[PDB]
Ligand binder design. Structure first.
Ligand code: NA
Ligand code: NA
Lengths: 427, 428
């Protein structure tokens, strides 16, 4: 990449949630291997982010690579309308088998946000078929479910700046963010949620939440009793429960799916990010026979969704290979060990002036700060320390690949601790 | 693939818009090469669909394969937050250069529907930054823009069964489907509906959104380019943004590189997908102007509020770059031109078949509209038996073959379409 290439990127290429009028530096990556990113200048960076949760097996993984190359040899893509193929069948077999018993109907899609849209549409079509006027979603504050309009409608109104779209977005119900920490349970936590359920139980199509960990909305970690209660309340009212595990799925919190922490099964389950081992985009929305059949037995005669690249063979083959790595079970002790190291090595941030809170769960470590980070200055600091840590707002957090070496993890936690010692990298 | 595999698929795997309780047969594909799909049992089928527009270079294309494997060796994926990479830069360079001058800012995304959502959000954020209360979209009937909530809100309400979501989806403005044909003459009467809507709602419209020249999923309709010219000028005069959804028409399918070229206009926002990657995997792009991109970033949010996890995926960008590189030769122009003449000539006889209502052809798109709905299971079986993969829908038997299709292969497709419509055997 020439200097001109970098200049072109700056002035012509949009990046996630960042200014085009005051663009901040971006770092040119040429390749990646193991748990490292390689910059164009040759510098190697230990990846603390897993490219946002997804790359649970690191980069240039020989098994993932071989499975992708082999599927390219057969066919990278063929349409899914009137056609099926081995990669999709093998993936759906794995997803059905590894998720709770009732979850046995799979709708593959292209991205997490679309998987949520699909889940929301399922709930709406389900009640339409049952002849019930139910179009409200009940969710938690500080939630994040994606960027498309339907998904946006259940994201935190404050965090997601709903004022920007006031009048275009359907108005859903927002219960208080769960207070009880992943910590003791306080029954008073439930009041707000109960109030909404009582006033709107006739109207609610589904409850949608991120189980245990609220990711993009604040990296919050709450008590599993909440899920137990939400499942019971949904059962009692006959309301559908959507669990968005696009960030928590596939081992990240220490259990295969975060719903396990409460031993509950949702009616609809959304999966993404780490589904493919972070090689390329793919998502899946699973639901029950009751939901899927009911929908097909309504006026539309089918579930009304079907993206062009639905069931893409290449992505399915990558997901199959990623799941085959998880099948070994090594991730269990890998995450447990990561959790121990995160707890131990982030503990000192609790003596730092710029820290508001420290919390760890599985392969997730979060240092919440008192003031917003200086994105440009802090990003450069991390790069100079030989690490790729991507903070945002008042969060400096780590979600490394499960295969990260202890010495690599140590470089990450050491950098985080150093960054929070004084105000240098803040505001 | 075993029969047990096929039973599992039927019982547990949803497919695009089709019943789970009364599913029709799906055919098991094991591989594909050139212009052929290879079924589990060994049967080879000439692909007439390009896997829904996308596979313009066919299957197992050497250049696409080589580029994809080479990128895998470097990195299949890395996040785009605070990071950039060569595949993304090369792709965006190509996209900026090949599209109209004002379209110089690129937002890469995951799918066509997401690209439309991005376009709609850009329009909404643009006006919010300018302090104007504009939240409505003016679109056309028979339009199709995707299946996510925002996209659904501008899709044809009858075709898409908006009654299912009545009260949840926002209610946009729907001008009548364009009547004047791409084959035929312009009729100024075509404008009254649109003119009446713009006049009544000019002050609240954030954007006009349309598929240029060809309305795909909504009816395989082919309309007169004067429409785009007229719309562009109206948008210009009114200060309203124009969104051209070229997810199906982009990259040469209608005979021009982008269907907007037929009218020699440029939209404010351009959506691309399907053939972007040569149909190897999903990727999309939404291009806009500097005016739009800067205005949004200067508003309250300080940025355009979107950013999907897999944004800028190196592997898909590498595939797209290789696909665009093939198009750079310009060979597609002649290929598409030749396909167009053969489609016109070989579908023409169908106009005399009793089951046929209309025959229309544009670029590498050939449509035979019938008088009655097709019998999906029976007709699909028939096509497979003729050694062709043609996927009909409703009253439409259409072809959109890969540009590399051989004349003999194209003839097998047209022969099959003609034979399918000779009597009512496969209808209703
Ligand atoms: Na299951
Ligand atoms: Na351009």
């Amino acid at each position: 990449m020439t200097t001109d290439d970098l200049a072109f990127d700056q002035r012509h290429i949009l990046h996630p949630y960042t200014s085009m009028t005051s663009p901040l530096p971006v770092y040119p990556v040429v390749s990646a291997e193991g748990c490292e990113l390689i910059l164009s200048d040759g510098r190697r960076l230990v990846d603390g982010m897993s490219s946002w949760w997804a790359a649970i097996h690191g980069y240039n993984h020989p098994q993932l690579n071989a499975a992708m190359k082999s599927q390219i040899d057969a066919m990278s893509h063929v349409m899914f309308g009137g056609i099926t193929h081995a990669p999709a069948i093998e993936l759906c077999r794995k997803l059905v088998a590894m998720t709770p018993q009732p979850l046995e109907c799979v709708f593959l899609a292209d991205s997490g946000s679309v998987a949520v849209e699909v889940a929301m549409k399922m709930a709406l079509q389900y009640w339409q078929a049952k002849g019930e006027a139910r179009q409200r979603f009940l969710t938690f504050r500080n939630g994040f479910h994606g960027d498309t309009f339907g998904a946006m409608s259940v994201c935190d109104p404050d965090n997601s700046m709903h004022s920007l779209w006031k009048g275009y977005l359907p108005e859903n119900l927002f219960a208080p963010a769960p207070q009880s920490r992943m910590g003791e349970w306080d029954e008073r936590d439930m009041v707000g949620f109960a109030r909404l359920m009582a006033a709107h139980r006739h109207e609610i199509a589904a409850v949608i939440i991120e189980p245990i960990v609220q990711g993009a909305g604040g990296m919050r970690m709450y008590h599993p009793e909440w899920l137990k209660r939400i499942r019971k309340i949904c059962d009692r009212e006959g309301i559908l429960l959507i669990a968005d595990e696009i960030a928590t799925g596939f081992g990240r919190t220490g259990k295969l799916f975060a719903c396990e922490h409460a031993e509950i099964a949702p009616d609809i389950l959304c999966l993404g990010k780490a589904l493919t081992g972070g090689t390329m985009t793919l998502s899946a929305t699973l639901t029950t026979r009751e939901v899927a059949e009911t929908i097909s037995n309504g006026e539309a005669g089918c579930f009304m969704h079907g993206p062009t690249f639905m069931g893409n063979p290449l992505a399915c083959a990558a997901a199959n290979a990623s799941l085959a790595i998880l099948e070994s079970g090594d991730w269990q002790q890998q995450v447990a060990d990561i959790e121990v190291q995160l707890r131990e090595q982030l503990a000192p941030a609790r003596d730092a002036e710029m820290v508001a809170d420290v919390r760890v769960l599985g392969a997730i470590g979060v240092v919440e700060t008192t003031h917003p980070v200086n994105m440009a200055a802090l990003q450069k600091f991390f790069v100079e320390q030989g690490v790729w840590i991507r903070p945002f707002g008042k969060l400096i957090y780590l979600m490394p690949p499960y295969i990260i070496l202890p010495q690599q993890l140590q470089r990450l936690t050491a950098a985080v601790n150093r960054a929070v010692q004084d105000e240098t990298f803040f505001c």
